[PDB]
């Protein structure tokens, strides 16, 4: 019993123990395709489906039972040269208004660097890093001069803002490159670059010496991340949370191929992917349980989720699935986080419960969401 009275006033992440850390984070869900997209080299909300985001759908997400936002932010083309790393002011500023929109609905939000780090193919070089020390120490300098200018512009803010250092980190094989085979020095750099994010940020004081920080593994893989994964020193406790992603099996949970339309103990086998049903879902979280929560380490999946079927039959397994891992998240000790593309909600790879720009529920996500907020807040 290490629990401990709540006596604040205003939404935020709280706890000391990774239980009551999750709980505080509740049920999450990510403005994908928004902040994140790019393209001609630039960060440009608009140009992967979306409209510009708005305070109406935060207040739609609020409505509907959702605890917190992950708010994926690509920097890309928006960051001036060395040795300031000068981030451009009306960029920024939009990034603060999104913050904002969560804060004024109630809900915690996370803001991240993201497709900067995409397939070690711009900036944030893991690849190169990791056999050249000027391209490391030159990521590192960019990483906390980014760092520091978004915890200086985001001081005030009270612990409902959380920041995660970088999003999906890889050479370029998505798991299965030269991480495997060279002994290891791509996961050190990777958690030296989280401990450089993390002293960035303490660095800055005040609120930010106190705040919950996102600091993933490699690839946000599950299995890289207990095996590789070091938490950061830190000069506060309990302050640090294991990100991964959890899609498995994602022939299933995106529809690549469109040929795998049911999942579980009750799928017909050739409608199936041939792995990733119930035991995996337990036995992959079960490995977060025992490495991070059970040694009093919070963790987090900031990426989950499902596509829609047009299909009635189809689109049953696919609440199913996502029932059964919102449950299962809640079970293992981690706040799970739904990934929202938006786009039209058409298709047959559509991750969209809510216009973006409108915050109208899309089809059938009230149905999606009540099975998700099952698993998290019923027992
Ligand atoms: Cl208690
Ligand atoms: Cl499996
Ligand atoms: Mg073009
Ligand atoms: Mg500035
Ligand atoms: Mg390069
Ligand atoms: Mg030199």
């Given at each position: 019993?290490?629990?401990?009275?709540?006596?604040?006033?205003?939404?935020?992440?709280?706890?000391?123990?990774?239980?009551?850390?999750?709980?505080?984070?509740?049920?999450?869900?990510?403005?994908?395709?928004?902040?994140?997209?790019?393209?001609?080299?630039?960060?440009?909300?608009?140009?992967?489906?979306?409209?510009?985001?708005?305070?109406?759908?935060?207040?739609?997400?609020?409505?509907?039972?959702?605890?917190?936002?992950?708010?994926?932010?690509?920097?890309?083309?928006?960051?001036?040269?060395?040795?300031?790393?000068?981030?451009?002011?009306?960029?920024?500023?939009?990034?603060?208004?999104?913050?904002?929109?969560?804060?004024?609905?109630?809900?915690?939000?996370?803001?991240?660097?993201?497709?900067?780090?995409?397939?070690?193919?711009?900036?944030?070089?893991?690849?190169?890093?990791?056999?050249?020390?000027?391209?490391?120490?030159?990521?590192?300098?960019?990483?906390?001069?980014?760092?520091?200018?978004?915890?200086?512009?985001?001081?005030?803010?009270?612990?409902?803002?959380?920041?995660?250092?970088?999003?999906?980190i890889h050479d370029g094989s998505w798991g299965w490159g030269d991480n495997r085979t060279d002994g290891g020095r791509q996961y050190a750099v990777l958690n030296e670059w989280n401990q450089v994010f993390v002293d960035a940020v303490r660095a800055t004081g005040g609120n930010n010496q106190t705040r919950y920080l996102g600091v993933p593994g490699y690839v946000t893989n599950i299995d890289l991340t207990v095996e590789n994964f070091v938490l950061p020193q830190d000069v506060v406790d309990n302050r640090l949370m294991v990100a991964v992603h959890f899609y498995d099996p994602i022939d299933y949970t995106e529809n690549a191929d469109n040929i795998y339309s049911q999942w579980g103990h009750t799928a017909d086998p050739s409608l199936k992917a041939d792995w990733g049903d119930e035991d995996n879902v337990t036995g992959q979280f079960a490995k977060m349980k025992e490495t991070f929560i059970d040694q009093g380490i919070p963790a987090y999946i900031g990426e989950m989720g499902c596509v829609h079927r047009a299909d009635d039959l189809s689109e049953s397994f696919r609440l199913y699935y996502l029932e059964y891992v919102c449950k299962a998240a809640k079970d293992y000790g981690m706040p799970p986080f739904y990934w929202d593309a938006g786009g039209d909600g058409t298709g047959t790879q559509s991750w969209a419960l809510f216009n973006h720009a409108t915050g109208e529920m899309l089809n059938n996500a009230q149905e999606v969401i009540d099975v998700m907020k099952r698993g998290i807040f019923t027992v």
């Open positions: 019993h290490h629990h401990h009275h709540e006596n604040l006033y205003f939404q935020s992440v709280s706890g000391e123990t990774p239980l009551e850390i999750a709980v505080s984070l509740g049920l999450g869900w990510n403005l994908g395709n928004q902040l994140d997209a790019h393209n001609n080299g630039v960060a440009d909300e608009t140009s992967w489906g979306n409209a510009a985001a708005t305070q109406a759908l935060f207040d739609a997400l609020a409505n509907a039972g959702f605890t917190s936002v992950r708010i994926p932010v690509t920097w890309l083309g928006h960051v001036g040269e060395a040795p300031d790393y000068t981030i451009d002011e009306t960029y920024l500023n939009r990034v603060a208004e999104v913050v904002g929109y969560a804060e004024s609905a109630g809900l915690n939000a996370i803001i991240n660097i993201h497709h900067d780090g995409a397939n070690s193919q711009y900036w944030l070089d893991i690849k190169d890093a990791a056999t050249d020390e000027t391209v490391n120490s030159a990521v590192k300098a960019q990483l906390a001069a980014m760092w520091t200018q978004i915890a200086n512009r985001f001081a005030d803010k009270g612990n409902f803002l959380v920041f995660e250092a970088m999003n999906e």
